[PDB]
Amino acid sequence: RDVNQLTPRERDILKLIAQGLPNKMIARRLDITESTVKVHVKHMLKKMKLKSRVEAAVWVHQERIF
DNA sequence: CCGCTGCCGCGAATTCCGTTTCAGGGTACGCCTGATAATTTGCATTTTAAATACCATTTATTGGTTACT
Known about the structure:
By secondary structure, the chain is an all-alpha fold. Helix content is 67%, strand content 0%. The chain contains 4 helices and no strands. Helix 2 (23-30) crosses helix 3. The protein is globular, with a radius of gyration of 11 Å. It binds one DNA strand through helix 3. One of its GO terms (biological process) is regulation of DNA-templated transcription. One of its GO terms (cellular component) is cytosol.
C-alpha cells in the first residue's frame, strides 16, 4: 500500500533497495545474514503485492517526494 | 743504295681543405587541325541510425519460514 506504513527497519531495507544496492550488499551494509534480508524482502513482496524491487523504486521516485 | 733526321705519341706524388651551384648565342610571322589534358556523371563495395536470429554458462530473484530478543 503505502511506503510509510513500513517499520523503521522495513523502511531501512526499502531505502537501501531504492538506493540501488543489491541484496548481498544490503547484508554487508547492515552486517546481517542473507536470511534476514530475504525475510524482509519477502514480507515487502507479500504486503506490497509486487513482483520486483524496480517497480517499487520507480514509484517511490515518481512523485519526487524527497 | 738499310744510313739519319723529324715528326707524332706518351708521361709527370699523397691525402684533406676552400669556393663564387655562377654567368655568356643576338634569328618571324600568321593559319587550320588533331591531340591531349583537362573537366563533367554513374556503380561498384563498404559501412548501415542499427534491426535482426540463435546458442551460451552464470547471478538474480528467490519459495518462502522455524525458532525465539
